[PDB]
Design a protein around this motif. Structure first.
Motif, PDB file in Angstrom:
ATOM      1  N   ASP A  70       0.839  -1.197   0.000  1.00 51.70           N
ATOM      2  CA  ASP A  70       0.000   0.000   0.000  1.00 51.70           C
ATOM      3  C   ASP A  70       0.870   1.242   0.000  1.00 51.70           C
ATOM      4  OD1 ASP A  70      -2.374   1.749   0.343  1.00 51.70           O
ATOM      5  OD2 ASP A  70      -1.636   1.959   2.400  1.00 51.70           O
ATOM      6  N   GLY A  71       0.571   2.160  -0.911  1.00 49.55           N
ATOM      7  CA  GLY A  71       1.291   3.420  -1.022  1.00 49.55           C
ATOM      8  C   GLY A  71       0.403   4.647  -1.001  1.00 49.55           C
ATOM      9  N   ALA A  72      -0.810   4.556  -0.401  1.00 51.79           N
ATOM     10  CA  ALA A  72      -1.741   5.685  -0.424  1.00 51.79           C
ATOM     11  C   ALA A  72      -2.336   6.151   0.916  1.00 51.79           C
ATOM     12  CB  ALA A  72      -2.871   5.384  -1.388  1.00 51.79           C
ATOM     13  N   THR A  73      -2.457   5.272   1.933  1.00 50.84           N
ATOM     14  CA  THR A  73      -3.100   5.596   3.222  1.00 50.84           C
ATOM     15  C   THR A  73      -2.558   6.884   3.888  1.00 50.84           C
ATOM     16  OG1 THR A  73      -3.712   3.284   3.555  1.00 50.84           O
ATOM     17  CG2 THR A  73      -3.712   4.666   5.535  1.00 50.84           C
ATOM     18  N   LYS A  74      -1.228   7.020   4.009  1.00 56.02           N
ATOM     19  CA  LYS A  74      -0.609   8.174   4.665  1.00 56.02           C
ATOM     20  C   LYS A  74      -0.410   9.392   3.749  1.00 56.02           C
ATOM     21  CE  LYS A  74      -0.247   6.604   8.958  1.00 56.02           C
ATOM     22  NZ  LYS A  74       1.014   6.191   9.629  1.00 56.02           N
ATOM     23  N   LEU A  75      -0.743   9.275   2.442  1.00 52.57           N
ATOM     24  CA  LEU A  75      -0.613  10.388   1.494  1.00 52.57           C
ATOM     25  C   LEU A  75      -1.512  11.557   1.872  1.00 52.57           C
ATOM     26  CD1 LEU A  75      -0.377   8.784  -2.098  1.00 52.57           C
ATOM     27  CD2 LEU A  75       1.448   9.897  -0.873  1.00 52.57           C
ATOM     28  N   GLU A  84      -0.535  17.666   0.012  1.00 50.74           N
ATOM     29  CA  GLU A  84       0.811  18.181  -0.270  1.00 50.74           C
ATOM     30  C   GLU A  84       1.679  17.132  -0.978  1.00 50.74           C
ATOM     31  OE1 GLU A  84       3.215  19.663   3.126  1.00 50.74           O
ATOM     32  OE2 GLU A  84       4.149  21.116   1.759  1.00 50.74           O
ATOM     33  N   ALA A  85       1.659  15.872  -0.490  1.00 50.41           N
ATOM     34  CA  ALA A  85       2.415  14.757  -1.065  1.00 50.41           C
ATOM     35  C   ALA A  85       1.933  14.424  -2.485  1.00 50.41           C
ATOM     36  CB  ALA A  85       2.322  13.534  -0.166  1.00 50.41           C
ATOM     37  N   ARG A  86       0.599  14.398  -2.704  1.00 47.82           N
ATOM     38  CA  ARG A  86      -0.022  14.129  -4.008  1.00 47.82           C
ATOM     39  C   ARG A  86       0.276  15.250  -5.012  1.00 47.82           C
ATOM     40  NH1 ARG A  86      -4.110   9.808  -3.510  1.00 47.82           N
ATOM     41  NH2 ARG A  86      -4.463   9.421  -1.282  1.00 47.82           N
ATOM     42  N   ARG A  87       0.294  16.523  -4.547  1.00 47.55           N
ATOM     43  CA  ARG A  87       0.591  17.698  -5.381  1.00 47.55           C
ATOM     44  C   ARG A  87       2.028  17.660  -5.900  1.00 47.55           C
ATOM     45  NH1 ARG A  87      -2.179  20.732  -1.420  1.00 47.55           N
ATOM     46  NH2 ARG A  87      -0.179  21.552  -0.664  1.00 47.55           N
ATOM     47  N   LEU A  88       2.997  17.341  -5.013  1.00 44.30           N
ATOM     48  CA  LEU A  88       4.421  17.254  -5.349  1.00 44.30           C
ATOM     49  C   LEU A  88       4.709  16.174  -6.395  1.00 44.30           C
ATOM     50  CD1 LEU A  88       5.804  17.826  -1.758  1.00 44.30           C
ATOM     51  CD2 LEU A  88       6.406  19.289  -3.671  1.00 44.30           C
ATOM     52  N   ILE A  89       4.041  15.002  -6.283  1.00 39.22           N
ATOM     53  CA  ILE A  89       4.184  13.891  -7.236  1.00 39.22           C
ATOM     54  C   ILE A  89       3.513  14.261  -8.574  1.00 39.22           C
ATOM     55  CG2 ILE A  89       3.796  11.392  -7.682  1.00 39.22           C
ATOM     56  CD1 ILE A  89       3.798  11.226  -4.388  1.00 39.22           C
ATOM     57  N   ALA A  90       2.360  14.973  -8.523  1.00 36.48           N
ATOM     58  CA  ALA A  90       1.636  15.442  -9.712  1.00 36.48           C
ATOM     59  C   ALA A  90       2.501  16.425 -10.517  1.00 36.48           C
ATOM     60  CB  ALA A  90       0.324  16.098  -9.315  1.00 36.48           C
ATOM     61  N   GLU A  91       3.305  17.257  -9.814  1.00 31.22           N
ATOM     62  CA  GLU A  91       4.242  18.228 -10.394  1.00 31.22           C
ATOM     63  C   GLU A  91       5.364  17.529 -11.175  1.00 31.22           C
ATOM     64  OE1 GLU A  91       5.615  21.249  -7.511  1.00 31.22           O
ATOM     65  OE2 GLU A  91       3.511  21.605  -6.962  1.00 31.22           O
ATOM     66  N   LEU A  92       5.654  16.254 -10.831  1.00 30.20           N
ATOM     67  CA  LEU A  92       6.667  15.428 -11.497  1.00 30.20           C
ATOM     68  C   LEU A  92       6.143  14.786 -12.797  1.00 30.20           C
ATOM     69  CD1 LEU A  92       8.083  13.833  -8.234  1.00 30.20           C
ATOM     70  CD2 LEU A  92       9.399  15.364  -9.680  1.00 30.20           C
ATOM     71  N   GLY A  93       4.850  14.974 -13.077  1.00 26.18           N
ATOM     72  CA  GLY A  93       4.192  14.479 -14.284  1.00 26.18           C
ATOM     73  C   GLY A  93       3.171  13.380 -14.068  1.00 26.18           C
ATOM     74  N   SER A  94       2.729  13.180 -12.813  1.00 27.36           N
ATOM     75  CA  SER A  94       1.767  12.139 -12.469  1.00 27.36           C
ATOM     76  C   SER A  94       0.310  12.579 -12.580  1.00 27.36           C
ATOM     77  CB  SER A  94       2.057  11.579 -11.081  1.00 27.36           C
ATOM     78  OG  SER A  94       1.141  10.553 -10.739  1.00 27.36           O
ATOM     79  N   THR A  95      -0.513  11.727 -13.210  1.00 25.86           N
ATOM     80  CA  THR A  95      -1.953  11.921 -13.394  1.00 25.86           C
ATOM     81  C   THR A  95      -2.732  11.050 -12.391  1.00 25.86           C
ATOM     82  OG1 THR A  95      -1.439  12.172 -15.765  1.00 25.86           O
ATOM     83  CG2 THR A  95      -3.781  12.041 -15.187  1.00 25.86           C
ATOM     84  N   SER A  96      -2.240   9.819 -12.128  1.00 20.82           N
ATOM     85  CA  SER A  96      -2.871   8.814 -11.265  1.00 20.82           C
ATOM     86  C   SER A  96      -2.698   9.006  -9.745  1.00 20.82           C
ATOM     87  CB  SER A  96      -2.397   7.416 -11.653  1.00 20.82           C
ATOM     88  OG  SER A  96      -2.731   7.110 -12.997  1.00 20.82           O
ATOM     89  N   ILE A  97      -1.677   9.771  -9.292  1.00 23.54           N
ATOM     90  CA  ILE A  97      -1.399   9.976  -7.858  1.00 23.54           C
ATOM     91  C   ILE A  97      -2.576  10.637  -7.098  1.00 23.54           C
ATOM     92  CG2 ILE A  97      -0.071  12.189  -8.018  1.00 23.54           C
ATOM     93  CD1 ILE A  97       0.900   9.132  -5.729  1.00 23.54           C
ATOM     94  N   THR A  98      -3.352  11.516  -7.765  1.00 26.62           N
ATOM     95  CA  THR A  98      -4.500  12.199  -7.156  1.00 26.62           C
ATOM     96  C   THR A  98      -5.629  11.226  -6.783  1.00 26.62           C
ATOM     97  OG1 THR A  98      -5.258  12.886  -9.356  1.00 26.62           O
ATOM     98  CG2 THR A  98      -3.996  14.516  -8.089  1.00 26.62           C
ATOM     99  N   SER A  99      -5.747  10.097  -7.512  1.00 25.67           N
ATOM    100  CA  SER A  99      -6.770   9.073  -7.284  1.00 25.67           C
ATOM    101  C   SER A  99      -6.224   7.760  -6.675  1.00 25.67           C
ATOM    102  CB  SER A  99      -7.544   8.796  -8.572  1.00 25.67           C
ATOM    103  OG  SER A  99      -6.685   8.318  -9.595  1.00 25.67           O
ATOM    104  N   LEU A 100      -4.933   7.739  -6.264  1.00 26.39           N
ATOM    105  CA  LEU A 100      -4.307   6.558  -5.661  1.00 26.39           C
ATOM    106  C   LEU A 100      -4.953   6.230  -4.311  1.00 26.39           C
ATOM    107  CD1 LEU A 100      -1.852   4.520  -6.328  1.00 26.39           C
ATOM    108  CD2 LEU A 100      -0.615   5.813  -4.612  1.00 26.39           C
ATOM    109  N   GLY A 101      -5.528   5.032  -4.232  1.00 24.17           N
ATOM    110  CA  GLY A 101      -6.223   4.536  -3.050  1.00 24.17           C
ATOM    111  C   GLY A 101      -5.563   3.339  -2.402  1.00 24.17           C
ATOM    112  N   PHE A 102      -6.125   2.908  -1.261  1.00 23.34           N
ATOM    113  CA  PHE A 102      -5.654   1.787  -0.447  1.00 23.34           C
ATOM    114  C   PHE A 102      -5.398   0.513  -1.262  1.00 23.34           C
ATOM    115  CE2 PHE A 102      -6.856  -1.938   2.287  1.00 23.34           C
ATOM    116  CZ  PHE A 102      -5.837  -1.896   3.212  1.00 23.34           C
TER     117      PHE A 102
END
Lengths: 169, 171
Positions: B97-102, B105-123
């Protein structure tokens, strides 16, 4: 959906649909967030490269211009490309011909906006492009498999997600 | 071929092959230019998001880290994301699991790296991503048809070129 697209755009994304002109008969069309920016019906299109500048934060139109790349001057087009500020989405579409009057400088400025095809754009070629200046581009390398009990290979967890490719140096 | 890929990479391109973990049993694997960066065998992987930082010019490894997004603190992960310098290729893979503690701020920083799926990453979702910071990428929205009198739909001119997509909103 917005602009008449196939799938709904994800959150914090601007929907767009664009088409080049059809010979020297039908003008190009540029649509963003269900708003027609440029079209033959709107009567704000012409021969050459048809450009629409959009605010990268709000999605509102800044300016729409067309430059005759067959019988016109390249100097006002180069001047227009240089005025483009950071945080601006740039949508470009051809009508009849958009390459004859293009210079190395004009092609370099468009390439800086994220264009690959502008360096090889020739006489009467049809071209549509959506780039920008100071806009973060999404990666083409991303794979995501949702945790769904219905289809989960390991029941409690989904199957392994794999990805391979070539990252540009 | 490098990393064990199906087709050889063209000139001035780094070959890569990555996989997420398999439940809480098999660790993820990150390979770049035939070098195994992170794996279960290498014993440098763990639960959460597994990140490999690569020099965008040479293809050499800068650092490899894993942050527990189930039972760990998000603060050192956010601090690690902020320390990423310009010209760095960022490879991310989930394990268990890589989403519970997100956080937002963490999702925004990864999205800035070119990620589309990080905003909807779930348990327990499985996710693999290869982005970067301060690397100029060419636009995915471009369509071009050459004028060829022999194949032209309108004889003197080619057919209409159409395109649709989603432009990411700034800020």
């Amino acid at each position: 959906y917005k602009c008449g697209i196939s799938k709904a755009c994800p959150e914090k994304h601007f929907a767009f649909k664009m088409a080049s002109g059809a010979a020297n008969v039908v003008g190009p069309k540029i649509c963003l967030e269900d708003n027609v920016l440029m079209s033959g019906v709107k009567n704000n299109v012409g021969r050459g490269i048809n450009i629409a500048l959009v605010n990268g934060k709000t999605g509102e139109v800044i300016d729409t211009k067309f430059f005759d790349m067959w019988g016109g001057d390249v100097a006002p087009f180069i001047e227009f490309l240089k005025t483009i500020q950071d945080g601006t989405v740039v949508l470009m579409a051809t009508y009849d011909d958009g390459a004859t009057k293009l210079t190395d400088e004009a092609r370099r400025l468009i390439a800086e906006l994220g264009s690959t095809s502008i360096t090889s754009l020739g006489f009467r070629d049809n071209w549509v492009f959506c780039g920008g200046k100071g806009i973060k581009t999404k990666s083409p390398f991303e794979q995501h498999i949702k945790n769904n009990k219905e289809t989960n290979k390991y029941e409690g967890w989904p199957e392994v997600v794999e990805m391979e490719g070539c990252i540009p140096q």
